[PDB]
Design a protein around this ligand. Structure first.
Ligand SMILES: *C[C@@H](COC(=O)CCCCCCCCCCCCCCC)OC(=O)CCCCCCCCCCCCCCC
Ligand SMILES: *C(=O)CCCCCCCCCCCCCCC
Lengths: 392, 226, 10, 409, 226
């Protein structure tokens, strides 16, 4: 007894043979959708956990985005810190960058240079080994090499190098003489990442590249994985936008493609569960033809008997997707909380997880949408046929 | 005036990739309150005739006018609403829903009409006690015997004041002990509110209590030939 | 792929 | 000689109704979809493993031995000692350079090495990956250099082009005297799988000897073994016939992660497709329950003629196993057809998308391989058949509990 | 001695959440070869009594002993084996499998018994030619007429030397032309191998050829009252 005559005519049809096995068959589609969603959520959460660690060890230790000038360097007077109010930015600091080439007494190497102000903080500050950040003073030409960069260069504290800038070489008319200086190291920094082989920190004031201006402003990002969306906003005039998609442009594009491939592979469970609903409803339509005819005779329009079977699939899909999302948000969190009940892998790395609230909702909504879409044909076939001319 | 008017009903059917003529020139008229009966063989097209009068099919060669309105210029929603308001169906296959209780099964026509919520708790069991089955209102068709739940199906159609009631072998499974018991109240409904009902069977022994005899052979009902 | 351990052997 | 348990229950599958043909199509498509993708995934993983041994394992030394900050003086004696090791197939001397290329207003991080051309073809397959007609023109004192495809693409250079590269000044006194540049003409280029192309270059050993102003001295010994998976141990005892200690290094620490990321993908895909097939098995459960409650009259007829409980219990098992077997075979055919033509299918898909995945910048290769093995197909067919049998078991047991007298027999 | 012995057979049935008494004190005995007939109304429990003798139910208040062995201390497999060996069933609903041919439909009792592979190709068509239907052995029940395939159902039970044959309206659909044709060989079987069969109908006109009359009303068969 419900005000909506459509729902009361189907609620009693969701389980009529009370038995230890008969009731189980009616919940097969819900179980399948729940499994497909709980498997789609956990694996993609684990991939998001890998992606977060990769971003926090590469993008979080390198300049995510820089605002420069199209005519080479950018004068801070013409564009101070007050003139930058771009969206998604939480910190702006002057910096100079360049792909410089090393020159030691034993070998040579390459690497990007980060000329920063010693007064301000840097993301690489905590990963310093017996080095004071204030030692980077202008004129002294001090430099801090990477842990994996100095190890292969055979350079310890108190040595000298001949850092050269080929990109910003002073193209004199008498051929080509590259700009170079003599930097003295003061120690190494160990960040336990991949940036310890091509990154070195120097003072912001350096004429080794060009000109007392800077190349640009390094700006931080709260979500550095959506630069392609922030790269089209209204920038200040006479300025250019650069990001990490020039150096790490294929590594993080690989992770998104791998996540899309894994999600497409795992979506086959939901796709098959959708076919299970089609089968379970086509079986119910052909078995309840007399009931459909009697409802049609009693005054139920075909558009109502269509929704009678539409809800039979919609309610199963919704209750499967919600349960699958709830179980996937719990299995990933408790993957190794009490015990590593995974069939413990031979990695010993404390497998990370990262549950994205928006992704879980998107997955649960796509599951409901496909469950509702798969119901159209079985519901339409239950109303397209003649009510009385077919059976009675 | 008259309540129903069907004339020149040439209903065809698909038998062998050709539209075989199963009904032709059906010109029977139905009055208000007066009871008629149609007798025919199981296969002469008598069962298919009832479906056309209820607006469940299309004769594609004729027209049926109910209460001064034909079924041609109406949609599906209008036909279903007319069926729920001024119609009623009784079948011989024991057409009930084996999911609902006896009380809920007969309240479905009232539920579709969206009546008062307490009205279905006052009129349904009234019909059940009129037929004498209110004691088993909270039961299941899988529990009732063959001849027990048939009266529930008989009383299901007689809830929302049916002006015209179609019947197709109402006494097909239940014995003759209650055959008169299910007919006395049906006859009393004619003198109580003035309702009309027609019954289609194949036997002439139970047609004695009817006020008319319009037996049909192959879509033709003319005289008392047998 | 996107799974890096960075374990070196001396 | 068909048994009565299966009998003619295949003919019992010839039923008639309303929209039942579409139900059968969905049943044979949903369980065939989870097999045709698993087969091609396992074939693609087998192709990846096959290409790993032909494009990475055959061009990378399995072990390398080098002492601590000391030019070798007794390197020949060490080579003679390491030549006779139970598990080492071949060994060859080499020098590690770290000089850089600066020509054409661009910078490249390259690792130059010096190997004997007469000995470089006895422990690696790098000679077989040279894009030129031949590398036999490698001699001592002719200023010959060969670089990978990535460096050549970055410099836009061809064969015979003269390039000046940076060379460290090996001064006995640790100072910063001058940068050294030596002009060398390209004697050809080589294209690898697509990862080491832009980070590999080699020169004749004797030329590198003259570039370092060094006599009969080399810095490292590279070794090729027979069993590649024991490289973490075969280099431990190989470095024992030396001084107190030199160094130990193998390919496991730098290329062993690729093998760990191949079995992991296989295990993930197998577990993700067992779920697909099992969910597709519910499609068999529903359509067999409907057949059980639609063929209830024949069950009572068989019980009245004297059929035992086991016969009725096993009729529907084979009834469901046939619907499962047809879907499995239709999936196997599709998975074999797609797997045998995977490389053109991926190439045609990438030309439709415009941008191509599996890039040759950071990955292992630039294409999608596919090697079909006739043992994974059997393993997935058996899994599908077992899941179908498990699905069509409980409904079969319920079919044997039908009372033959409750329904009018 | 005697072949069958049932006494104090009190069979109940579920009608209205209570075990209504549908059979009580049934003490009929069946001999070897002698032919009897039970006549009763359609609804008095005569159709339900047939299933109890075949071991398809449980009377829960009595016992039936066949060939000196009751069905109480037997499992389902033993009862199925007894049904396939020393029993035989004939119904009026034309219970056949519309997937098998006429030749394979009658070989099912022999197929379950696991006889010789060539034995089912020598005894089945022998029965078909004895009844006179071997020309339509390789056909389908969907093709044969209503009165044609009925004899196939009659001969299906008479394959594995049935000692006792149960019947329930054998002549329900076919006309009287073949009514004597299907009875002459059934009577001859009593003289060829000495088999016994009981038939339950509702008419006394076809019981003339029977050697006994044990008509029953509401589970009681005492005298010739009618
Ligand atoms: C380098 C790898 C990384 O892949 C990963 O994402 C690593 C994932 C590790 C996950 C550990 C999860 C532990 C918890 C599991 C819980 C399971 C619960 C199950 C329910 C109880 O790269 C890859 O793996 C890439 C792999 C690509 C594999 C193949 C994808 C094929 C897609 C085919 C789509 C065909 C579409 C055809 C349409 C017609
Ligand atoms: C990770 O550290 C390196 C992984 C290198 C191989 C990456 C392969 C990505 C694509 C896998 C596709 C598998 C299915 C192929 C058939 C659809």
């Amino acid at each position: 007894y419900q005000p909506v005559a459509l729902f009361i005519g189907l609620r009693y049809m969701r389980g009529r043979a009370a038995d230890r096995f008969g009731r189980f068959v009616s919940w097969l589609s819900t179980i399948g959708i729940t499994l497909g969603v709980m498997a789609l959520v956990t694996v993609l959460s684990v991939m998001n956990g890998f992606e977060r660690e990769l971003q926090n060890n590469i993008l979080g230790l390198m300049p995510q985005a820089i605002l420069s000038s199209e005519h080479g360097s950018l004068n801070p007077q013409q564009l101070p810190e007050t003139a930058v109010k771009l969206d998604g930015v939480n910190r702006v600091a002057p910096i100079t960058t360049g792909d410089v080439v090393l020159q030691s007494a034993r070998s040579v190497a390459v690497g990007v240079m980060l000329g920063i102000d010693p007064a301000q903080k840097d993301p690489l500050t905590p990963y310093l080994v017996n080095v004071k950040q204030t030692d980077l003073e202008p004129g002294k030409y001090n430099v801090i090499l990477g842990e994996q960069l100095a190890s292969q260069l055979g350079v310890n504290r108190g040595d000298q190098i001949r850092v050269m800038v080929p990109s910003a070489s002073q193209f004199t008319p008498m051929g080509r003489i590259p700009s170079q200086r003599l930097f003295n190291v003061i120690g190494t920094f160990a960040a336990n990442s991949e940036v310890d082989g091509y990154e070195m920190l120097v003072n912001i004031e350096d004429a080794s590249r060009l000109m007392g201006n800077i190349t640009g402003w390094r700006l931080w990002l709260d979500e550095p994985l959506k630069v392609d969306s922030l790269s089209q906003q209204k920038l200040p005039e006479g300025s250019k936008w650069q990001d990490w998609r020039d150096r790490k442009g294929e590594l993080f594009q690989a992770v998104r493609m791998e996540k899309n491939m894994m999600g497409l592979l795992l979506s086959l469970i939901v796709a098959v569960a959708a076919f299970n609903i089609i089968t379970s409803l086509g079986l119910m339509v052909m078995e309840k033809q007399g009931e459909v005819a009697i409802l049609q005779t009693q005054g139920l329009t075909p558009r109502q008997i269509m929704m009678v079977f539409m809800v039979q699939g919609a309610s199963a899909g919704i209750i499967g997707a919600i349960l699958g999302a709830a179980l996937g948000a719990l299995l990933a969190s408790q993957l190794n909380n009490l015990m590593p009940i995974i069939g413990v892998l031979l990695d010993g790395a404390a497998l990370p997880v990262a549950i994205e609230p928006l992704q879980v909702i998107v997955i649960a909504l796509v599951a409901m949408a496909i469950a509702l879409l798969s119901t159209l044909y079985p519901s339409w076939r239950a109303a397209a046929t003649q009510p009385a001319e077919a059976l009675r | 005036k008259i309540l129903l008017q069907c004339d020149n009903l040439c209903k065809r059917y698909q038998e062998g990739s050709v539209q075989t003529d199963v009904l032709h020139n059906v010109s029977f008229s139905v009055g208000e309150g007066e009871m008629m009966a149609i007798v025919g063989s199981s296969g002469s097209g008598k069962s298919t005739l009832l479906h056309l009068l209820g607006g469940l099919d299309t004769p594609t060669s004729g027209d049926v006018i109910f209460n001064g309105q034909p079924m041609s210029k109406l949609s599906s929603a209008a036909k279903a609403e007319l069926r729920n308001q001024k119609l009623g169906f009784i079948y011989q296959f024991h057409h009930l829903l084996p999911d609902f209780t006896a009380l809920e099964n007969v309240a479905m026509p009232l539920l579709i009409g969206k009546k008062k919520p307490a009205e279905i708790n006052s009129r349904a069991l009234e019909m059940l006690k009129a037929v004498g089955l209110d004691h088993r209102a909270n039961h299941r068709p899988s529990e009732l015997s063959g001849g027990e739940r048939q009266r529930v199906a008989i009383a299901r159609a007689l809830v929302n004041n049916p002006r015209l009631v179609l019947a197709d072998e109402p006494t097909g499974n239940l014995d003759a002990r209650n055959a008169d018991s299910i007919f006395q109240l049906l006859g009393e409904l004619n003198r109580l509110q003035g309702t009309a009902f027609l019954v289609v069977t194949h036997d002439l022994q139970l047609a004695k209590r009817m006020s008319r005899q319009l037996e049909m052979r192959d879509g033709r009902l003319t005289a008392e030939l047998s | 792929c996107s799974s890096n351990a960075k374990i070196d052997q001396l | 000689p068909l048994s009565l348990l299966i009998g003619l229950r295949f003919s019992r599958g010839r039923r008639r109704g309303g929209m039942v043909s579409l139900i059968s199509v969905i049943s044979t498509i949903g369980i065939a979809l989870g097999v045709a993708v698993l087969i091609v995934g396992l074939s693609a993983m087998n192709g990846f493993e096959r290409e790993l041994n032909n494009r990475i394992l055959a061009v990378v030394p399995h072990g390398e031995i080098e002492a601590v900050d000391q030019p070798w003086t007794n390197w020949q004696e060490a080579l003679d000692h390491v030549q006779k090791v139970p598990g080492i197939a071949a060994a060859a001397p080499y020098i590690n350079f770290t000089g850089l290329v600066e020509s054409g207003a661009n910078l490249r991080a390259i690792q130059v090495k010096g190997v004997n051309p007469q000995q470089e073809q006895r422990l690696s397959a790098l000679p077989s990956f040279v894009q030129g007609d031949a590398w036999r023109n490698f001699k001592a004192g002719e200023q010959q250099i060969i670089i990978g495809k990535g460096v050549a693409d970055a410099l836009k250079v061809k064969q015979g082009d003269w390039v000046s590269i940076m060379i460290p000044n090996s001064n006995p006194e640790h100072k910063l005297m001058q940068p050294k540049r030596v002009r060398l003409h390209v004697a050809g280029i080589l294209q690898l799988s697509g990862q080491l192309d832009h980070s590999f270059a080699m020169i004749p050993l004797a030329d590198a000897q003259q570039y370092l102003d060094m006599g009969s001295s080399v810095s490292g010994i590279a070794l090729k073994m027979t069993d590649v998976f024991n490289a973490n141990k075969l280099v431990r005892d190989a470095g024992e016939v030396t001084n107190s200690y030199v160094y130990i290094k193998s390919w496991i620490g730098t290329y062993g992660y690729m093998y760990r990321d191949i079995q992991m993908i296989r295990a993930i895909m197998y577990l993700a497709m067992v779920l697909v097939i099992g969910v597709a098995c519910f499609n068999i459960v529903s359509t067999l329950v409907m057949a059980v409650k639609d063929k209830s009259g024949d069950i009572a007829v068989l019980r009245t003629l004297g059929a035992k409980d086991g016969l009725i219990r096993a009729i529907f098992v084979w009834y469901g196993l046939l619907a499962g077997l047809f879907g499995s075979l239709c999936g196997v055919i599709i998975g074999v057809v797609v797997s045998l033509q995977l490389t053109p299918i991926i190439e045609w898909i990438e030309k439709l998308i415009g941008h191509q995945f599996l890039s040759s910048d950071i990955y292992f290769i630039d294409f999608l391989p596919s090697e079909l093995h006739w043992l994974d197909v059997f393993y997935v067919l058996v899994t599908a058949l077992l899941l179908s049998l498990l699905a069509s078991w409980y409904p079969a047991r319920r079919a044997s509990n039908i009372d033959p007298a409750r329904v009018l027999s």
